[PDB]
Design a protein around this ligand. Sequence first.
Ligand SMILES: COc1cc(CO)ccc1Oc1ccc([N+](=O)O)cc1[N+](=O)O
Ligand SMILES: COc1cc(CO)ccc1Oc1ccc([N+](=O)O)cc1[N+](=O)O
Lengths: 115, 115, 115, 115
Amino acid sequence: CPLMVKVLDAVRGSPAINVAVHVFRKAADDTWEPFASGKTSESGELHGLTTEEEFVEGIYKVEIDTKSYWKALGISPFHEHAEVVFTANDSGPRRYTIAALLSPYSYSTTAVVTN
Amino acid sequence: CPLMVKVLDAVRGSPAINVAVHVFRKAADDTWEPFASGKTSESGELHGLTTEEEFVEGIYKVEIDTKSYWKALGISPFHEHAEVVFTANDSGPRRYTIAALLSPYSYSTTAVVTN
Amino acid sequence: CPLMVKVLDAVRGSPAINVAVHVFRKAADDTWEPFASGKTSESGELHGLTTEEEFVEGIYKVEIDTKSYWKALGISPFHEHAEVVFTANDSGPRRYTIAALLSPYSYSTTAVVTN
Amino acid sequence: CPLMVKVLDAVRGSPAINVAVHVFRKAADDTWEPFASGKTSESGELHGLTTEEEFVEGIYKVEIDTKSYWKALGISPFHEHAEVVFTANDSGPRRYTIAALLSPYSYSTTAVVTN
Ligand SMILES: COc1cc(CO)ccc1Oc1ccc([N+](=O)O)cc1[N+](=O)O
Ligand SMILES: COc1cc(CO)ccc1Oc1ccc([N+](=O)O)cc1[N+](=O)O
């Protein structure tokens, strides 16, 4: 699993379940091409987006559909979505965790890059 | 001043100065068109992006060029930029402050919206 | 104004108003003695806590009464308060802004320190 | 494991290893009595602080020794430590994760309370 997404809810103090997540790769013409997607699990985690073979160096975007999350909870949010854009680079045997902590008008995201 | 951007540096404990910010507005054809741009001042704030006349309802994207920021300081950061996307003025004119706090592998953004 | 405190509410996207703040300074006998207190204003800011004469070197603790804040709004939050502890003025006088962003199960705090 | 601590480093994008963590329980005389302690592992996690039998309702403080962490990395930090203070309450079969994300002049903490 070279790429995992983990989302927490700062209002409820819980994993953010069933949040849709879309990952894109930047193509040679500078467009974003769909790469991988899924819905966070009960643990707020999304595993199995990609494989080491397909996850080559390049620029990726991870879009977390925060607006739908909040709306399903009856809560008015600010952002359309949260976007995390980064370059994946093969300097070493790397796993990338993209973590996000959500509030209705604020979010933070952090990258945990290990081995 | 219906739209202001404020950026702080969590490593230095200081305003993040000379950060480039580009704003875009989703067009009729579903494309991101350029709307305004600027750079943060010595206080980390960016004022004068737009006017209340110009700042009509729409979906806006505020792209904060954090990578250029960290690179100019000898740090190779994780993200390309921080993107903040939101619907604005959908219940009449409001004043928006988009704040961001930056670390090399992590950022948070919050919106303060006043009437 | 060598010490200012600013608090925002990540659920509302607004300044966090009427937040009580107590400041303490570690004494010669290793005890937390009362130093100053106040409440955030309509802009979420707390000014006038101390003076440059009074604000000598020391270890200070800024206790932000987030539980009282959230309770007055029908929310049962996780934390009792947010505590910010730091050495101040150890290389001469500085001006400190202690900022905090609050959600019911989460908070962040940052310091901006200027000369 | 009713109480687990997880610490991340926002500057390096990694777990924060070998951070000392001290947990206290508030006694009837309002003093903090040592309760449990340890050092975060290679995964930035600290498991096995306590047991369900000993972790009764009450007010606890978790102190994360952030200053020593940063100093061991050659980095000048702002806070003496990060403190997280909360009431543990038996409304349900609960596991408490106290997470913290560290930067030299900023930290965030979140509580993830599950089952
Ligand atoms: C405050 O702790 C977190 C802060 C952020 C800000 O974006 C994101 C996640 C946080 O909590 C975790 C982050 C990463 C993580 N991980 O899989 O290495 C685990 C986290 N956690 O507290 O369970
Ligand atoms: C973590 O507290 C803050 C977070 C952000 C971005 O998520 C922006 C400001 C925060 O607190 C402040 C810190 C400094 C400051 N200032 O004027 O030097 C103002 C702040 N604030 O509360 O807007």
